[PDB]
Amino acid sequence: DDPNKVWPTGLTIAESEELHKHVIDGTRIFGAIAIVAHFLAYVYSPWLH
Amino acid sequence: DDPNKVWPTGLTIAESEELHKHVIDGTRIFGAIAIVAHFLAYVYSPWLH
Amino acid sequence: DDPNKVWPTGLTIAESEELHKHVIDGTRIFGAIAIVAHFLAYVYSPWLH
Amino acid sequence: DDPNKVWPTGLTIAESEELHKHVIDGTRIFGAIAIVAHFLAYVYSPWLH
Amino acid sequence: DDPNKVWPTGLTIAESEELHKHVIDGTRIFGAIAIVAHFLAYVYSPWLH
Amino acid sequence: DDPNKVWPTGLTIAESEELHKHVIDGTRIFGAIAIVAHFLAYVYSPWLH
Amino acid sequence: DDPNKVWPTGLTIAESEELHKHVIDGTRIFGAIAIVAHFLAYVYSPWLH
Amino acid sequence: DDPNKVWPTGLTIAESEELHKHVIDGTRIFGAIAIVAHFLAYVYSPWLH
Amino acid sequence: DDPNKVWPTGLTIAESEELHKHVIDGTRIFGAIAIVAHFLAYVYSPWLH
Amino acid sequence: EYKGHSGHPLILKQEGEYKGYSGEPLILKQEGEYKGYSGTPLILEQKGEYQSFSGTPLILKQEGEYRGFSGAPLILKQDGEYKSFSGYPLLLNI
Amino acid sequence: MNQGRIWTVVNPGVGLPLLLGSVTVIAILVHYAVLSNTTWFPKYWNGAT
Amino acid sequence: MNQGRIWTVVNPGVGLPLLLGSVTVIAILVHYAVLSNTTWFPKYWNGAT
Amino acid sequence: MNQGRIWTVVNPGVGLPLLLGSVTVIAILVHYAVLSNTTWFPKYWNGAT
Amino acid sequence: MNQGRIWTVVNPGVGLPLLLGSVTVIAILVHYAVLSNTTWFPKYWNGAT
Amino acid sequence: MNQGRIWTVVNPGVGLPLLLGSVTVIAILVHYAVLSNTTWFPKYWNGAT
Amino acid sequence: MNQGRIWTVVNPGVGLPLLLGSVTVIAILVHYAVLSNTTWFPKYWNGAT
Amino acid sequence: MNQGRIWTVVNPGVGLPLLLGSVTVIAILVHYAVLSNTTWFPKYWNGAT
Amino acid sequence: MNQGRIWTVVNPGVGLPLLLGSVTVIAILVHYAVLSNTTWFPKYWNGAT
Amino acid sequence: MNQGRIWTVVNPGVGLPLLLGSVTVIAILVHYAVLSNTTWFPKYWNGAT
Ligand code: BCL
Ligand code: BCL
Ligand code: BCL
Ligand code: BCL
Ligand code: BCL
Ligand code: BCL
Ligand SMILES: CC(C)=CCC/C(C)=C/C=C/C(C)=C/C=C/C(C)=C/C=C/C=C(C)/C=C/C=C(C)/C=C/C=C(\C)CCCC(C)(C)O
Ligand SMILES: CC(C)=CCC/C(C)=C/C=C/C(C)=C/C=C/C(C)=C/C=C/C=C(C)/C=C/C=C(C)/C=C/C=C(\C)CCCC(C)(C)O
Ligand SMILES: CC(C)=CCC/C(C)=C/C=C/C(C)=C/C=C/C(C)=C/C=C/C=C(C)/C=C/C=C(C)/C=C/C=C(\C)CCCC(C)(C)O
Ligand SMILES: CC(C)=CCC/C(C)=C/C=C/C(C)=C/C=C/C(C)=C/C=C/C=C(C)/C=C/C=C(C)/C=C/C=C(\C)CCCC(C)(C)O
Ligand SMILES: CC(C)=CCC/C(C)=C/C=C/C(C)=C/C=C/C(C)=C/C=C/C=C(C)/C=C/C=C(C)/C=C/C=C(\C)CCCC(C)(C)O
């Protein structure tokens, strides 16, 4: 292998992994907001009551 | 790394961040107008009453 | 920076801003006609009556 | 400026303006026919009666 | 100007005009058949009766 | 003019005309089968009865 | 003419005809299976009864 | 003919035939699972009963 | 054959197989979560009861 | 490097072969010819002319001009300017 | 008959299929419209009671 | 009449088919709207009772 | 039979699939129309009462 | 009035047709909405009872 | 059987997927048509009363 | 405010039209939803009884 | 089994996604068909009466 | 968190707009589902009786 | 597990987005199906009577 290898997308392995950190953080941030939204829905809607 | 590196989109890092300032400011402008629209809707519609 | 820089769209900054003058003026013209159309709708339709 | 400048579409300013003459004249022709069609509709349909 | 100028579509002015003769003639032929079809519809359907 | 001129589609005039012979012959054959299908529909369905 | 002429699709006349043999044979096999399917439908469904 | 001839897709005849082995095997495996699914449907659903 | 042969997608055989390991592992992880979801659905819904 | 808000870690490192979370093996190797699970043969080899299953012939050979099955002529020859069928003129040239 | 130069800026390979296609689609839409909004057109197909 | 330079940045091969196409689609939509929301337009086609 | 030169400006790889495709789509639409607006066509499939 | 540089990264040949097209589509949607959810708009077209 | 040269002007990579795709779509459409317009086909799936 | 580098891998000529377009489509969908699921929004347009 | 050479004229990157995609779409269509036209399939999901 | 190398074979300019776009579409679909299949969600918007 | 070489002929930039996209679409379709054809799933969201 070669860490300097430019892959067909133009990104190196290090660049692809650094990019994915934004995707994982974005997913976790979306999940945290969704968890609060589900808690509010449970507290105010008749769901699960 | 190199701050002068032209990425596959043709924009440099400095150019991409300068562009995003318009997106962030545009989102804030859209949000402010939407907040006023929600206040008007609450005052005049039966929602939340 | 360089004002002569041709951007990926082929337009320079001066050319893009000159083009946008038509979009801003066009939006104002569309808005002016829409304001008159809303006045006619209010005068003749039962909306807001 | 340069009137001989070939723009990205391949047309010069003079060629673009000459082309637009057909669009403006075509719009006027479509408008004239539409005005007659609206006159016939008023004379024969119950609209505005 | 130059009558030999090959335009972006690859056709010259003379070739574009010669092509349009088929479109104009084709439109006239379609119109002629449509006129007959409308006559038959009037004779056999209750439209305009 | 020149009959050997390769047009933008890659076909010569003679090749385009030879190709069109199949389109005309195919249209005539489709028409013949459609005529028989319409005859069968008339003989067996209540259409035109 | 030249039978070795590579046409715009990349196939020669001989290669295009050889390919069409599979299309004709595939059409005939599809027809044979469709004929049996229509026979079974007639024997078991109320169609044509 | 030439078995080394690279065709327009980039695959040789031998490579295309080897690829088709996966397509045929995949079809046969899909069929076997579909046969079991139809047997289970027959045993548990009212179809064919 | 040659394991260093770059195929039309740009991936070598070794790279395609290493990529597929993520596809198989992803399918197995998706399946495991789906199995738990089906167990919860059975325990809480009237399905299969 | 990126400093996310949702704590750390954000990604898992990999210095070699991918390790499956769902155990192993993850793929099956091949020593040569594809070994199908649905028995053999998987394909029929072609030694020459395409051996049809629905009899022969499969195509009609063409010699010279196209032999129209719906009589003749199939096209109208054009010499010079286009012969209008809806009278004249057909254009208003500039 | 004065728009003959349109084929110098609109590609015939695009504009001719769109023209013939749109004319055909409009004709189908007019048939479906009269069929859905009239009683005599469906009765014509139903024929003998 | 002052937008004539639009064809220097918008390709006529794209903007002219879209213009003529959109104008035609809008006309069809207006016909369907008046046809669906009025009694006199369908009765006009139905003609004699 | 006089339009044979259309294949010099319309690419057969595009116009022939569109022709055969459109003719087939039109035929399907006519079948669905007569099937939906008549009683004898659905009854034909229903066969024995 | 401060977004004039958007045409340096968004191609006018794309953004201008999309802008003018979207504005037109939105206007159509608002007309259809008021037409479907009000009695005075359809009555306006129906006119004299 | 005389159309074998169509593959010299229609690319097999386009015409063969379109053919097999269209034939499959037509078959699906005929099944849905007979299923919706007959009582015996849905009853066949419903099986035992 | 930390995603400013997204424009180095996502082309602004694509992502900016998609962002502005999607935001506009979402607003339309929310308006249609409240209009269809409430009585006060349509009554607002209907105005005077 | 004799069609193995199809991959010399149909690109696997196109034909394989289309094949696997179509087969999946067909399966979905058959499930929706039996679900809509039978009582036992929806009752199976409804479970306990 | 181990799929970080996916951006070496999937272009971020495509996969990131598709990811964010799909997530947004799914949220819209879930909102429409709960809105159509519950009474408390529409009643929440209707507010005061 | 033996199909690992598919990525040598199917581009991962296409097949991976299609796979993950299709799987997500299938899940949405199954949720909509059970929601529409069962009473307990909508009742679950409606919660307390
Ligand atoms: C404040 C909420 C932040 C957050 C802030 C932190 C902090 C601070 C830490 C971590 C740490 C961790 N986080 Mg985090 N993290 C969040 C979302 C997530 C989600 C997810 C929702 O799917 C996951 C799987 C993770 C994953 C993880 C691990 C990598 C790590 C160790 C385990 C752990 O749970 O620690 C404990 C994690 C928590 C107590 C929070 C988990 C998220 C909860 C469930 C979100 C609900 C809403 C929250 C209460 C209020 C915010 C609402 C706003 C509207 C967003 N984070 C959100 C975006 N995370 C820890 C670590 O090891 O860092 C080095 C750590 O110190
Ligand atoms: C804990 C849930 C994890 C998981 C963790 C493990 C672990 C841990 C091991 C395997 C091992 C194996 N796994 Mg795994 N695996 C899961 C999902 C799957 C799925 C699937 C859902 O479709 C499949 C087909 C497989 C496939 C396999 C085989 C390659 C192998 C079993 C060989 C054997 O005979 O072992 C005989 C049995 C054993 C050695 C021990 C028991 C392992 C059993 C067979 C795992 C069954 C998982 C089951 C299908 C899914 C349960 C999901 C839960 C309901 C959440 N995994 C999920 C993601 N898997 C084993 C192996 O060979 O690794 C080298 C192993 O040790
Ligand atoms: C275990 C189920 C496996 C399978 C395993 C095998 C095995 C094992 C063998 C074959 C062999 C053959 N298979 Mg296989 N095969 C399956 C699916 C298929 C399907 C299909 C579903 O459409 C087809 C058309 C074929 C085609 C064929 C022929 C190329 C060949 C000769 C069969 C025959 O009747 O020989 C005449 C009869 C016999 C030789 C003995 C009896 C039949 C044997 C046992 C194979 C029957 C498979 C049957 C169609 C599967 C139906 C689905 C299952 C019931 C669930 N396979 C599935 C995926 N196949 C055989 C061969 O010739 O290999 C060299 C062989 O030994
Ligand atoms: C077994 C079913 C096979 C089949 C096997 C054969 C065989 C075997 C032969 C042909 C032969 C012929 N086939 Mg074939 N063929 C089938 C499907 C078709 C279909 C179609 C369904 O649309 C067509 C149009 C054809 C076309 C033809 C002609 C080129 C030729 C018959 C005329 C002639 O010169 O006969 C001259 C020969 C004879 C008169 C001998 C008797 C042939 C009989 C009449 C069978 C003809 C095929 C018949 C239409 C198939 C119907 C199948 C349905 C399932 C019922 N085949 C299917 C896929 N075909 C014949 C030929 O010329 O081969 C060199 C031949 O011997
Ligand atoms: C057998 C059915 C075949 C067919 C076989 C033939 C044959 C055989 C001949 C023609 C000939 C002609 N055909 Mg052809 N043709 C068919 C379909 C068509 C269709 C169509 C359905 O739209 C059209 C427009 C044509 C067009 C024509 C002309 C080019 C030409 C007559 C010139 C003239 O003035 O003759 C004046 C009149 C005559 C010479 C004699 C009487 C007419 C002859 C018998 C042709 C009538 C065909 C008729 C239009 C379509 C019948 C369809 C069936 C009822 C299903 N064919 C189908 C596919 N055609 C003729 C020609 O000139 O060939 C060199 C000829 O001999
Ligand atoms: C037979 C049906 C043919 C047809 C055959 C002819 C013939 C034959 C002639 C023309 C001529 C003319 N045609 Mg033409 N034409 C048709 C369809 C059309 C349509 C249309 C439907 O939209 C249009 C706009 C035209 C346009 C014209 C003019 C350019 C010109 C008359 C100008 C003049 O000097 O008048 C005064 C001219 C005369 C009094 C001579 C006779 C004019 C004929 C009667 C005009 C018929 C047009 C009419 C709209 C056709 C309706 C369809 C039928 C009901 C089937 N044609 C169809 C396709 N056309 C003429 C020409 O070329 O002049 C130089 C001519 O001689
Ligand atoms: C649906 C409900 C209920 C409600 C909705 C209500 C609603 C919103 C309605 C809205 C309606 C609107 C907006 C209508 C707008 C209509 C317009 C604008 C029409 C315009 C017509 C233009 C034409 C005809 C142009 C022809 C151009 C032409 C022929 C150009 C020719 C060019 C050439 C020859 C090239 C030259 C090359 C070289 C220079 C070298 O010579
Ligand atoms: C839905 C409801 C209720 C209401 C809606 C109502 C409503 C709005 C309806 C609107 C209807 C409209 C607008 C209809 C318009 C119809 C028109 C315009 C028809 C035009 C037909 C044109 C034809 C037939 C052209 C043939 C061209 C041809 C054959 C060209 C051939 C070219 C060649 C051979 C190349 C030569 C190359 C070389 C020069 C080198 O030789
Ligand atoms: C919906 C309701 C109620 C009402 C709506 C009613 C309504 C509006 C209906 C309208 C219907 C219409 C308009 C129908 C029109 C039908 C037509 C036009 C059919 C045409 C068929 C053409 C065929 C079959 C062509 C085959 C070509 C072929 C085989 C070509 C072969 C070429 C080759 C071999 C290449 C050679 C290369 C080299 C020269 C080098 O050898
Ligand atoms: C229909 C019914 C009834 C029911 C349906 C039920 C059903 C099936 C539901 C399914 C739901 C599912 C599956 C939900 C899934 C949700 C997911 C996965 C959310 C993911 C969010 C991801 C985010 C937010 C990513 C942000 C990325 C970001 C910001 C990336 C930034 C990148 C940068 C800056 C480039 C840097 C480059 C360099 C570093 C080189 O400079
Ligand atoms: C309608 C009704 C009632 C009923 C409908 C009934 C019906 C038909 C249902 C059908 C259902 C079906 C068929 C379901 C199928 C589900 C499947 C197959 C799921 C597959 C999941 C796959 C995954 C999760 C893949 C992840 C890949 C991944 C993460 C890949 C990562 C790759 C990387 C990192 C690149 C590395 C590159 C390098 C190594 C070179 O560096």
Numbering used by the authors:
A (entry chain J), B (entry chain H), C (entry chain F), D (entry chain D), E (entry chain B), F (entry chain R), ...: 3 to 51
J (entry chain S): 4 to 97
K (entry chain A), L (entry chain C), M (entry chain Q), N (entry chain E), O (entry chain O), P (entry chain G), ...: 1 to 49
Quote the paper.
Only the pucBAc gene pair is unable to produce a functional LH complex, so we could purify four different LH2 complexes that will be referred as PucA-LH2, PucB-LH2, PucD-LH2, and PucE-LH2 from this point onward. The absorption spectra of the three other Rps. palustris LH2 complexes are essentially the same and have two strong near-IR absorption peaks at 804 and 856 nm, corresponding to the well-known B800 and B850 BChl a Qy bands. SDS-PAGE also shows that the α-polypeptide of PucB-LH2 is slightly larger than those in other complexes, consistent with its predicted sequence, and that there is a faint lower–molecular weight form of this α-polypeptide possibly arising from partial posttranslational processing. We examined this point further for the α-polypeptide with the longest C-terminal domain, which is from PucB-LH2. We used AlphaFold 2 (34) to calculate a model for the α- and β-apoproteins in the PucB-LH2, which shows that the 17 untraced C-terminal residues of this α-polypeptide form a unstructured membrane-extrinsic domain. The likely lack of a fixed conformation would account for its absence from the density map. The B850 pairs in PucA-LH2, PucB-LH2, and PucE-LH2 from Rps. palustris have H-bond patterns similar to that in the LH2 from Rbl. acidophilus 10050. On the basis that the B800 Qy absorption band of PucA-LH2 (also, PucB-LH2 and PucE-LH2) is higher, relative to the B850 band, than that of a standard B800 to B850 LH2 complex, it is reasonable to propose that these γ-bound BChls increase the 800-nm absorption of the complex.
